[PDB]
Short mmCIF file of C-alpha atoms and ligand atoms in Angstrom, two decimals:
data_model
loop_
_atom_site.label_atom_id
_atom_site.label_comp_id
_atom_site.label_asym_id
_atom_site.label_seq_id
_atom_site.Cartn_x
_atom_site.Cartn_y
_atom_site.Cartn_z
CA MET A 261 88.08 313.95 270.19
CA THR A 262 88.69 313.32 266.49
CA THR A 263 90.36 309.96 267.10
CA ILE A 264 87.55 308.93 269.46
CA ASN A 265 84.99 309.71 266.76
CA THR A 266 87.14 307.79 264.26
CA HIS A 267 87.44 304.69 266.46
CA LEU A 268 83.67 304.79 266.95
CA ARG A 269 82.62 305.29 263.32
CA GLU A 270 84.61 302.31 262.01
CA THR A 271 81.93 299.94 263.37
CA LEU A 272 78.70 301.69 262.36
CA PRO A 273 77.39 301.60 258.78
CA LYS A 274 77.26 304.60 256.46
CA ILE A 275 74.01 306.20 257.62
CA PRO A 276 73.17 309.72 256.41
CA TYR A 277 71.38 311.04 259.48
CA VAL A 278 73.14 312.11 262.66
CA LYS A 279 72.99 309.66 265.56
CA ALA A 280 72.81 310.55 269.25
CA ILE A 281 76.44 309.77 270.07
CA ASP A 282 77.43 311.84 267.04
CA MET A 283 75.46 314.74 268.51
CA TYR A 284 77.27 314.26 271.82
CA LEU A 285 80.67 314.21 270.11
CA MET A 286 79.77 317.30 268.09
CA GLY A 287 78.82 319.11 271.30
CA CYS A 288 82.05 318.10 273.02
CA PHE A 289 84.10 319.20 270.02
CA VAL A 290 82.27 322.52 269.92
CA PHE A 291 83.15 323.02 273.58
CA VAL A 292 86.82 322.19 273.00
CA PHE A 293 86.97 324.44 269.93
CA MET A 294 85.40 327.30 271.89
CA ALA A 295 87.99 326.78 274.63
CA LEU A 296 90.77 327.08 272.06
CA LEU A 297 89.17 330.14 270.44
CA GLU A 298 88.78 331.70 273.89
CA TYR A 299 92.50 331.29 274.46
CA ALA A 300 93.16 332.82 271.04
CA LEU A 301 90.99 335.79 271.99
CA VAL A 302 92.84 336.15 275.30
CA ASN A 303 96.22 336.07 273.56
CA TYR A 304 95.07 338.61 270.97
CA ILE A 305 93.80 341.26 273.41
CA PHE A 306 96.43 340.50 276.08
CA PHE A 307 98.92 343.12 274.87
CA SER A 308 96.23 345.80 274.50
CA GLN A 309 94.50 345.15 277.84
CA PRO A 310 96.16 343.01 280.55
CA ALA A 311 93.06 342.98 282.78
CA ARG A 312 90.57 341.90 280.11
CA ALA A 313 92.52 338.64 279.81
CA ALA A 314 92.25 337.91 283.54
CA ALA A 315 88.57 338.87 283.47
CA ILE A 316 87.84 336.50 280.58
CA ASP A 317 89.80 333.72 282.29
CA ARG A 318 88.02 334.15 285.63
CA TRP A 319 84.68 334.20 283.81
CA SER A 320 85.41 331.12 281.69
CA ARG A 321 86.60 329.11 284.71
CA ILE A 322 83.04 329.19 286.08
CA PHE A 323 81.18 329.52 282.75
CA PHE A 324 82.41 326.46 280.84
CA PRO A 325 81.49 323.73 283.39
CA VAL A 326 78.05 325.33 283.81
CA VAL A 327 77.22 325.23 280.10
CA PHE A 328 78.67 321.73 279.80
CA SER A 329 76.52 320.44 282.66
CA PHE A 330 73.46 322.17 281.20
CA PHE A 331 74.05 320.59 277.79
CA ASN A 332 74.65 317.22 279.45
CA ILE A 333 71.37 317.36 281.37
CA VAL A 334 69.41 318.54 278.32
CA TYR A 335 70.89 315.76 276.17
CA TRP A 336 70.25 313.03 278.76
CA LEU A 337 66.71 314.34 279.27
CA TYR A 338 65.89 314.44 275.56
CA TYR A 339 67.30 310.97 274.88
CA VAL A 340 66.45 309.13 278.11
CA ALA B 300 117.09 307.62 277.04
CA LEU B 301 114.07 309.43 278.47
CA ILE B 302 115.09 308.57 282.05
CA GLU B 303 118.61 309.85 281.39
CA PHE B 304 117.21 313.13 280.10
CA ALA B 305 114.99 313.38 283.19
CA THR B 306 118.01 312.86 285.46
CA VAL B 307 120.02 315.46 283.53
CA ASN B 308 117.23 318.00 283.87
CA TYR B 309 116.85 317.21 287.57
CA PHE B 310 120.56 317.85 288.16
CA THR B 311 120.64 320.95 285.94
CA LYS B 312 121.06 324.37 287.62
CA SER B 313 122.23 322.62 290.81
CA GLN B 314 125.11 320.32 289.75
CA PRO B 315 125.69 321.12 286.06
CA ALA B 316 129.05 319.34 286.07
CA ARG B 317 127.42 315.97 286.79
CA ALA B 318 124.67 316.70 284.24
CA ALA B 319 127.11 317.52 281.44
CA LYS B 320 129.27 314.54 282.43
CA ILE B 321 126.46 312.00 282.27
CA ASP B 322 125.21 313.53 279.02
CA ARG B 323 128.62 313.28 277.34
CA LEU B 324 128.87 309.73 278.69
CA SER B 325 125.41 308.74 277.41
CA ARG B 326 126.41 310.07 274.00
CA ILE B 327 128.70 307.01 273.79
CA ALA B 328 127.15 304.48 276.16
CA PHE B 329 123.80 304.05 274.38
CA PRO B 330 124.98 303.53 270.76
CA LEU B 331 127.73 301.05 271.69
CA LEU B 332 125.30 299.05 273.82
CA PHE B 333 122.73 299.01 271.02
CA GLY B 334 125.37 297.86 268.54
CA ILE B 335 126.48 295.07 270.88
CA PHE B 336 122.88 293.98 271.42
CA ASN B 337 122.21 293.96 267.67
CA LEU B 338 125.32 291.89 267.00
CA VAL B 339 124.44 289.39 269.73
CA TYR B 340 120.79 289.09 268.67
CA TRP B 341 121.47 288.65 264.96
CA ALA B 342 124.40 286.29 265.49
CA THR B 343 122.63 283.97 267.93
CA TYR B 344 119.47 283.92 265.81
CA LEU B 345 121.10 283.40 262.40
CA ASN B 346 123.45 280.63 263.56
CA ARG B 347 120.51 278.30 264.30
CA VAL C 180 56.64 296.78 240.97
CA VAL C 181 58.42 297.69 244.21
CA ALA C 182 57.05 296.94 247.66
CA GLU C 183 56.34 299.92 249.90
CA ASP C 184 58.59 298.97 252.83
CA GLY C 185 60.91 297.19 250.39
CA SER C 186 64.03 299.34 250.59
CA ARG C 187 67.20 298.38 252.47
CA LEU C 188 69.16 301.31 251.02
CA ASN C 189 71.03 302.94 253.89
CA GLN C 190 73.02 305.40 251.77
CA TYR C 191 71.17 305.67 248.45
CA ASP C 192 67.60 306.69 247.63
CA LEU C 193 65.57 304.85 245.00
CA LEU C 194 63.87 307.27 242.60
CA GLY C 195 62.07 304.97 240.16
CA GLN C 196 62.23 302.09 237.73
CA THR C 197 62.57 302.25 233.96
CA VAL C 198 61.98 299.17 231.83
CA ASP C 199 63.05 298.53 228.25
CA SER C 200 63.29 295.73 225.71
CA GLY C 201 66.15 295.08 223.33
CA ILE C 202 67.79 292.48 221.10
CA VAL C 203 71.43 291.50 221.60
CA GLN C 204 73.73 289.50 219.33
CA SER C 205 76.10 286.94 220.83
CA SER C 206 78.51 284.43 219.32
CA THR C 207 75.71 281.83 219.21
CA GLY C 208 72.74 283.80 217.91
CA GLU C 209 70.40 286.74 218.42
CA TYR C 210 68.63 286.90 221.78
CA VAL C 211 65.95 289.06 223.40
CA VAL C 212 67.03 291.00 226.49
CA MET C 213 64.67 292.64 228.98
CA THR C 214 66.40 295.56 230.69
CA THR C 215 65.29 297.27 233.90
CA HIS C 216 67.01 300.31 235.41
CA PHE C 217 66.64 301.47 239.01
CA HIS C 218 67.50 305.16 239.32
CA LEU C 219 69.43 305.80 242.54
CA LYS C 220 70.49 309.09 244.13
CA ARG C 221 73.11 309.09 246.88
CA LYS C 222 72.46 310.75 250.23
CA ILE C 223 75.11 313.30 251.23
CA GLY C 224 74.21 313.19 254.92
CA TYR C 225 77.02 310.90 256.05
CA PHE C 226 79.75 312.37 253.88
CA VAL C 227 78.96 315.87 255.10
CA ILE C 228 79.37 315.08 258.80
CA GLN C 229 82.35 312.79 258.24
CA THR C 230 84.47 314.63 255.64
CA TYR C 231 83.16 318.15 254.99
CA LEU C 232 82.71 319.00 258.67
CA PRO C 233 86.23 317.89 259.73
CA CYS C 234 87.82 319.55 256.68
CA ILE C 235 86.11 322.89 257.33
CA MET C 236 86.83 322.65 261.06
CA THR C 237 90.50 321.95 260.34
CA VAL C 238 90.74 324.88 257.93
CA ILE C 239 89.17 327.19 260.53
CA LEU C 240 91.47 325.89 263.28
CA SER C 241 94.41 326.56 260.97
CA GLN C 242 93.31 330.10 260.08
CA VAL C 243 92.95 330.80 263.81
CA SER C 244 96.76 330.85 263.89
CA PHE C 245 96.80 334.32 262.30
CA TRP C 246 95.12 335.99 265.29
CA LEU C 247 97.90 334.91 267.66
CA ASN C 248 100.84 337.21 268.28
CA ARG C 249 103.97 337.05 266.14
CA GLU C 250 106.23 336.51 269.17
CA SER C 251 104.75 333.03 269.77
CA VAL C 252 106.54 330.61 267.42
CA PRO C 253 105.84 327.23 269.12
CA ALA C 254 102.07 327.79 269.25
CA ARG C 255 101.70 328.78 265.59
CA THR C 256 104.06 326.00 264.51
CA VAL C 257 101.99 323.47 266.46
CA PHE C 258 98.80 324.83 264.88
CA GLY C 259 100.24 324.44 261.39
CA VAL C 260 101.79 321.00 261.78
CA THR C 261 98.77 319.52 263.58
CA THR C 262 96.37 320.86 260.97
CA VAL C 263 98.57 319.39 258.22
CA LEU C 264 98.71 316.00 259.96
CA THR C 265 94.93 316.02 260.40
CA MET C 266 94.39 316.92 256.75
CA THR C 267 96.74 314.13 255.68
CA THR C 268 94.97 311.52 257.81
CA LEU C 269 91.63 312.73 256.47
CA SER C 270 92.76 312.67 252.83
CA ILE C 271 93.94 309.10 253.36
CA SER C 272 90.88 307.87 255.26
CA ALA C 273 88.20 309.44 253.04
CA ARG C 274 89.69 307.91 249.88
CA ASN C 275 89.57 304.43 251.45
CA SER C 276 85.80 304.13 250.99
CA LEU C 277 85.60 304.29 247.20
CA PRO C 278 86.94 301.68 244.77
CA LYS C 279 90.39 302.40 243.34
CA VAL C 280 89.31 304.52 240.39
CA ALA C 281 91.80 306.46 238.28
CA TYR C 282 90.02 309.84 238.26
CA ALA C 283 89.44 312.59 240.82
CA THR C 284 86.00 312.79 242.43
CA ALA C 285 84.48 315.95 243.91
CA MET C 286 85.32 315.12 247.53
CA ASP C 287 88.93 314.78 246.42
CA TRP C 288 88.82 318.31 244.99
CA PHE C 289 87.43 319.61 248.29
CA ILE C 290 90.12 317.80 250.27
CA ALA C 291 92.84 319.08 247.94
CA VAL C 292 91.67 322.67 248.30
CA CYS C 293 91.51 322.39 252.09
CA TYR C 294 95.03 320.93 252.12
CA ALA C 295 96.20 323.83 249.97
CA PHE C 296 94.65 326.26 252.45
CA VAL C 297 96.36 324.64 255.44
CA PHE C 298 99.72 324.55 253.65
CA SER C 299 99.24 328.21 252.69
CA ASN D 1 49.46 310.76 230.30
CA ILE D 2 52.48 310.89 227.98
CA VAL D 3 51.88 313.44 225.22
CA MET D 4 53.43 312.80 221.80
CA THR D 5 54.23 315.84 219.65
CA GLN D 6 54.37 314.55 216.08
CA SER D 7 55.96 316.79 213.45
CA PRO D 8 55.35 318.14 210.95
CA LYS D 9 51.59 318.72 211.15
CA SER D 10 51.25 318.66 207.35
CA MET D 11 53.93 318.15 204.72
CA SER D 12 54.06 317.46 200.99
CA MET D 13 56.85 315.64 199.15
CA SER D 14 57.13 314.44 195.57
CA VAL D 15 57.92 310.88 194.47
CA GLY D 16 61.42 309.49 194.89
CA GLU D 17 62.94 311.37 197.85
CA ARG D 18 63.71 310.34 201.41
CA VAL D 19 61.14 311.71 203.87
CA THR D 20 61.63 311.90 207.64
CA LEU D 21 58.81 312.19 210.18
CA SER D 22 59.50 312.96 213.84
CA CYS D 23 57.64 312.04 217.02
CA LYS D 24 58.89 313.39 220.34
CA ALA D 25 57.41 312.16 223.61
CA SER D 26 57.18 314.00 226.92
CA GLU D 27 58.43 311.39 229.40
CA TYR D 28 60.55 308.29 228.80
CA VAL D 29 59.19 305.72 226.35
CA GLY D 30 61.97 303.26 225.67
CA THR D 31 61.66 301.75 222.19
CA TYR D 32 57.90 301.33 222.70
CA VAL D 33 56.50 303.68 220.05
CA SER D 34 54.67 302.19 217.09
CA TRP D 35 53.99 303.79 213.72
CA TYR D 36 50.66 303.25 211.93
CA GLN D 37 49.56 304.11 208.39
CA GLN D 38 45.91 305.15 208.10
CA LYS D 39 44.79 305.52 204.51
CA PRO D 40 41.44 307.26 203.90
CA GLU D 41 38.27 305.28 204.70
CA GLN D 42 40.51 302.59 206.20
CA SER D 43 41.61 301.38 209.60
CA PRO D 44 45.22 301.97 210.68
CA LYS D 45 47.73 299.26 209.80
CA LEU D 46 50.80 298.74 211.97
CA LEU D 47 53.99 299.68 210.13
CA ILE D 48 56.78 299.94 212.73
CA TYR D 49 56.40 298.12 216.03
CA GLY D 50 58.85 298.31 218.88
CA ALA D 51 61.00 301.24 217.82
CA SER D 52 62.62 300.06 214.56
CA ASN D 53 61.10 296.71 213.57
CA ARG D 54 59.13 296.19 210.37
CA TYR D 55 55.85 294.33 210.69
CA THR D 56 55.47 291.21 208.55
CA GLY D 57 54.48 292.55 205.15
CA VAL D 58 56.01 296.03 205.34
CA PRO D 59 58.28 297.17 202.46
CA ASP D 60 61.94 297.90 203.11
CA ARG D 61 61.53 301.66 202.58
CA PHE D 62 59.85 302.25 205.95
CA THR D 63 62.43 302.21 208.71
CA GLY D 64 62.51 303.72 212.18
CA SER D 65 65.11 305.25 214.46
CA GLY D 66 64.59 304.99 218.19
CA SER D 67 65.76 306.66 221.38
CA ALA D 68 64.45 307.34 224.87
CA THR D 69 62.21 310.26 223.88
CA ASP D 70 62.64 311.30 220.22
CA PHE D 71 61.89 308.93 217.34
CA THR D 72 62.04 309.21 213.56
CA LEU D 73 60.46 307.34 210.65
CA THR D 74 62.15 307.44 207.25
CA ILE D 75 60.52 306.50 203.94
CA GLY D 76 63.12 306.45 201.19
CA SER D 77 61.69 306.97 197.68
CA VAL D 78 58.00 307.22 198.47
CA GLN D 79 55.61 305.72 195.93
CA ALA D 80 52.16 306.89 194.84
CA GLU D 81 50.39 304.65 197.39
CA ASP D 82 52.35 305.85 200.44
CA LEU D 83 50.00 308.85 200.80
CA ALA D 84 48.09 308.46 204.07
CA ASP D 85 48.08 309.58 207.68
CA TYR D 86 51.03 308.49 209.82
CA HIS D 87 50.38 308.16 213.55
CA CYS D 88 52.99 307.52 216.22
CA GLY D 89 51.78 306.04 219.48
CA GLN D 90 53.68 305.07 222.60
CA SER D 91 52.84 302.04 224.71
CA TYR D 92 55.32 302.27 227.61
CA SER D 93 52.33 303.63 229.53
CA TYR D 94 48.66 303.65 228.63
CA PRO D 95 48.77 304.28 224.86
CA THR D 96 48.50 307.91 223.73
CA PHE D 97 48.64 308.64 220.01
CA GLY D 98 49.99 311.60 218.08
CA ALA D 99 48.09 314.13 216.00
CA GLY D 100 49.25 312.56 212.74
CA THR D 101 50.87 314.04 209.64
CA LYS D 102 49.00 314.51 206.37
CA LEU D 103 51.14 313.37 203.44
CA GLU D 104 50.37 315.18 200.17
CA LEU D 105 51.93 315.51 196.74
CA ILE E 279 102.96 296.02 280.24
CA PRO E 280 102.19 298.99 277.93
CA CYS E 281 99.64 300.45 280.35
CA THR E 282 101.97 300.50 283.37
CA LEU E 283 104.83 301.73 281.19
CA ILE E 284 102.58 304.57 280.00
CA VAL E 285 101.76 305.35 283.64
CA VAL E 286 105.42 305.58 284.62
CA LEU E 287 105.96 307.67 281.48
CA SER E 288 103.39 310.03 282.97
CA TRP E 289 105.11 309.93 286.37
CA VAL E 290 108.40 311.04 284.77
CA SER E 291 106.91 314.54 284.66
CA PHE E 292 107.09 314.74 288.46
CA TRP E 293 110.88 315.09 288.23
CA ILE E 294 111.08 317.63 285.39
CA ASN E 295 111.53 321.18 286.69
CA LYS E 296 108.31 323.09 287.31
CA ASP E 297 109.34 326.04 285.11
CA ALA E 298 109.19 324.05 281.86
CA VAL E 299 105.43 324.21 281.26
CA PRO E 300 105.13 322.90 277.66
CA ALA E 301 107.21 319.80 278.42
CA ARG E 302 104.99 318.70 281.31
CA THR E 303 101.73 319.60 279.56
CA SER E 304 102.79 317.64 276.48
CA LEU E 305 103.80 314.68 278.66
CA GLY E 306 100.44 314.61 280.42
CA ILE E 307 98.15 315.12 277.46
CA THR E 308 99.96 312.80 275.04
CA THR E 309 100.04 310.15 277.77
CA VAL E 310 96.26 310.54 278.11
CA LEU E 311 95.87 310.15 274.34
CA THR E 312 97.97 306.98 274.21
CA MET E 313 96.08 305.68 277.25
CA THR E 314 92.68 306.06 275.60
CA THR E 315 93.96 304.45 272.39
CA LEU E 316 95.27 301.47 274.36
CA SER E 317 91.99 301.21 276.26
CA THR E 318 90.17 301.13 272.92
CA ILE E 319 92.37 298.25 271.73
CA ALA E 320 92.07 296.27 274.98
CA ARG E 321 88.28 296.56 274.97
CA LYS E 322 88.20 295.72 271.25
CA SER E 323 89.91 292.40 272.03
CA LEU E 324 86.79 290.67 273.47
CA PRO E 325 83.17 291.16 272.29
CA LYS E 326 80.70 293.85 273.32
CA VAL E 327 79.71 293.08 276.92
CA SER E 328 77.74 295.47 279.11
CA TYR E 329 79.54 294.61 282.37
CA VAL E 330 82.92 295.65 283.75
CA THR E 331 85.71 293.10 283.35
CA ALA E 332 89.07 292.97 285.12
CA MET E 333 91.09 294.35 282.19
CA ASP E 334 89.06 297.45 281.35
CA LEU E 335 88.98 298.12 285.09
CA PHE E 336 92.79 298.17 284.97
CA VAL E 337 92.93 300.46 281.94
CA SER E 338 90.35 302.80 283.51
CA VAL E 339 92.38 303.02 286.71
CA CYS E 340 95.45 303.84 284.61
CA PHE E 341 93.49 306.51 282.74
CA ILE E 342 92.39 307.98 286.08
CA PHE E 343 95.99 307.99 287.29
CA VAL E 344 97.17 309.91 284.23
CA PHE E 345 94.26 312.34 284.62
CA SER E 346 95.28 312.83 288.24
CA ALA E 347 98.90 313.50 287.29
CA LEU E 348 97.87 316.13 284.74
CA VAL E 349 95.47 317.93 287.07
CA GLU E 350 98.13 317.76 289.80
CA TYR E 351 100.59 319.61 287.58
CA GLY E 352 97.85 322.08 286.69
CA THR E 353 97.19 322.92 290.33
CA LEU E 354 100.96 323.05 290.93
CA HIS E 355 101.42 325.67 288.21
CA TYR E 356 98.43 327.67 289.43
CA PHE E 357 99.72 327.68 293.01
CA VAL E 358 103.27 328.60 291.96
CA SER E 359 102.01 332.11 291.18
CA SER E 360 100.25 332.35 294.55
CA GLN E 361 102.65 330.54 296.93
CA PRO E 362 105.73 328.71 295.61
CA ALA E 363 106.59 326.64 298.70
CA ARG E 364 103.16 325.00 298.55
CA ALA E 365 103.89 323.62 295.08
CA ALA E 366 107.49 322.81 296.03
CA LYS E 367 106.22 320.56 298.81
CA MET E 368 103.41 319.21 296.61
CA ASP E 369 105.94 317.92 294.07
CA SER E 370 107.88 315.82 296.57
CA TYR E 371 104.61 314.69 298.17
CA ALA E 372 103.30 313.42 294.83
CA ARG E 373 106.62 311.72 294.06
CA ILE E 374 105.92 309.36 296.98
CA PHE E 375 102.12 309.26 296.91
CA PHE E 376 101.74 308.21 293.26
CA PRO E 377 103.94 305.07 293.00
CA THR E 378 102.81 303.90 296.44
CA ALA E 379 99.14 304.17 295.47
CA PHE E 380 99.82 302.42 292.16
CA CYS E 381 101.69 299.55 293.84
CA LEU E 382 98.97 299.15 296.46
CA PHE E 383 96.27 299.08 293.78
CA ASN E 384 98.23 296.57 291.70
CA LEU E 385 98.74 294.28 294.70
CA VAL E 386 95.07 294.43 295.71
CA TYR E 387 93.84 293.94 292.14
CA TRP E 388 96.13 291.02 291.33
CA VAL E 389 95.42 289.26 294.64
CA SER E 390 91.66 289.74 294.33
CA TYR E 391 91.47 288.63 290.69
CA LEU E 392 93.95 285.74 290.85
CA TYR E 393 92.66 284.04 294.02
CA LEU E 394 89.00 284.08 293.00
CA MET F 261 105.49 309.50 257.00
CA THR F 262 105.24 306.43 259.22
CA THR F 263 101.44 306.85 259.31
CA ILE F 264 101.30 306.82 255.51
CA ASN F 265 103.46 303.69 255.51
CA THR F 266 101.37 301.84 258.10
CA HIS F 267 98.16 302.68 256.27
CA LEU F 268 99.63 301.48 252.98
CA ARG F 269 101.02 298.19 254.31
CA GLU F 270 97.74 297.06 255.89
CA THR F 271 96.38 296.56 252.35
CA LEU F 272 99.22 294.73 250.57
CA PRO F 273 100.06 291.16 251.66
CA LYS F 274 103.14 289.99 253.53
CA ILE F 275 105.69 290.46 250.74
CA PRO F 276 109.47 290.13 251.26
CA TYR F 277 111.13 292.37 248.67
CA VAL F 278 111.11 296.17 248.50
CA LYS F 279 108.33 297.48 246.27
CA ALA F 280 108.59 300.78 244.41
CA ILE F 281 106.21 302.66 246.70
CA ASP F 282 108.16 301.34 249.69
CA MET F 283 111.30 302.73 248.06
CA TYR F 284 109.64 306.13 247.67
CA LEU F 285 108.51 306.14 251.29
CA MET F 286 111.98 305.12 252.47
CA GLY F 287 113.54 307.93 250.44
CA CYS F 288 111.12 310.51 251.81
CA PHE F 289 111.72 309.27 255.35
CA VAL F 290 115.48 309.46 254.82
CA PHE F 291 115.10 313.08 253.73
CA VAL F 292 112.94 313.86 256.77
CA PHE F 293 115.36 312.17 259.17
CA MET F 294 118.22 314.09 257.55
CA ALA F 295 116.38 317.36 258.13
CA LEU F 296 115.92 316.44 261.79
CA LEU F 297 119.58 315.47 262.19
CA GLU F 298 120.53 318.75 260.52
CA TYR F 299 118.56 320.69 263.11
CA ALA F 300 120.16 318.67 265.91
CA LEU F 301 123.61 319.46 264.51
CA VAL F 302 122.73 323.16 264.27
CA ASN F 303 121.48 323.20 267.87
CA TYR F 304 124.69 321.47 268.97
CA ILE F 305 127.06 324.09 267.52
CA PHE F 306 124.73 327.09 267.93
CA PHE F 307 126.07 328.35 271.27
CA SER F 308 129.70 327.97 270.16
CA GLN F 309 129.53 329.60 266.72
CA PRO F 310 126.32 330.93 265.12
CA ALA F 311 128.08 331.86 261.86
CA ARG F 312 128.59 328.22 260.89
C1 V8D G 401 81.53 321.72 264.80
C2 V8D G 401 81.42 320.21 265.04
O1 V8D G 401 82.68 319.64 264.85
C3 V8D G 401 82.76 318.51 264.53
O2 V8D G 401 81.59 317.77 264.33
C4 V8D G 401 84.12 317.86 264.31
C5 V8D G 401 85.13 318.36 263.51
N1 V8D G 401 86.13 317.49 263.60
C6 V8D G 401 85.77 316.52 264.41
N2 V8D G 401 84.55 316.73 264.84
C7 V8D G 401 83.82 315.88 265.76
C8 V8D G 401 84.78 314.92 266.45
C9 V8D G 401 82.78 315.06 264.99
C10 V8D G 401 82.92 314.86 263.63
C11 V8D G 401 81.97 314.12 262.95
C12 V8D G 401 80.89 313.59 263.62
C13 V8D G 401 80.75 313.79 264.98
C14 V8D G 401 81.70 314.53 265.66
#
């Protein structure tokens, strides 16, 4: 994600406001960072509770695509 | 080199003799071949 | 006078003009010089999202490594080395914009402190 | 409106000593403050135009010191005829004069 | 050349033993990263055009192939915990299905775009 | 290290000899490569004798 943003920003000028594709990349990076933090949370409470980890995994498996599709539709509705 | 490692890992835990043999052979076959290629390349391109 | 729509400043922000008259002395004589200053004020909007956001995100990603278990060496090592590589690439890229000056700006101090945090 | 605080409001100095008057503006007035000498029953006469530039016919004892906001006017070894009002007035904007300083002996 | 060599680099994971998870995950994801960088370069060659050429089509198909290899290993590892023989057969099935599909696509693409 | 080098060289022109900063980067890369070779040597003789 970082190298994609880098390859994109080399062509645009230095504009202070946030573009639309920058908002999209920020959303995607927030989703990836929340995935990584969710794994960190699983690995932290895995020794204490072995079922909470499986519960969080089974919940995330159906929760992440839903929020991503919702954000995608809201973004494409607000901009198009 | 990567393909040789892949073959070694594929033969590991089933025929470890062949894996160790080809690894000890590739510890000598790759550097000598690279040295020969370097000598040939540099010689035939500096003679001109 | 400045026109209303007359501003092509993407990054800066024109505050106002300030005129003055003076008298300079050259090797040929003594001349009259009309001076006009345009006060500019840089916009931090781009530098925030392009340097301060990745630096803070990298520092947070690196401090996440503490919440992992101690019996997981490859994961924490990967965290550390990737955060260091990212910080290095960022410290190199962000400096590229400015002219090659011989002092340390503020953004350089921020980048240095974030690098110290990742190394720590 | 650029206000000019001229100090001191009233001062007395004997003959033969360097005297310094001050005139501090509010906003920026870059070397555009003139100094006038208004004797009694007379119209003001320009002494120091620009910031430090003697008008044609001004003795060498009047000299100014300029800046962006604060300005000074020095009269070394005042004579008996240098006793008048001394007004500073900026012109970088619409001209606004100072309150003036009474010079006494 | 670099795109197909990256694709066969990704295929190499199909022979590494299924127990070594980090090796295969690193293979897949780093191959995806190099693939997107190479796609960026290839598209940066010619100017900004809003249609689909024959080169970016190739690099997109390669990107899809690497994506497919990675998700295939993901499903393999998930099914290993449920039923191992399923994944054991899936490995040897993919070993034949991937290069065959790539060769068929290359033949079709080159024939269609050379004799046009 | 190689990223630092590639970023640095894209600025300077095509120049034959070895500059001072190139010498520093080559020394740092030699030290890094020596660390990696040291680990490889340790991993080679680990199973046989961990004391050495
Ligand atoms: C919390 C949001 O994270 C980020 O914006 C972030 C941190 N590192 C990288 N990114 C993303 C790629 C980004 C940076 C700058 C502009 C747009 C997108």
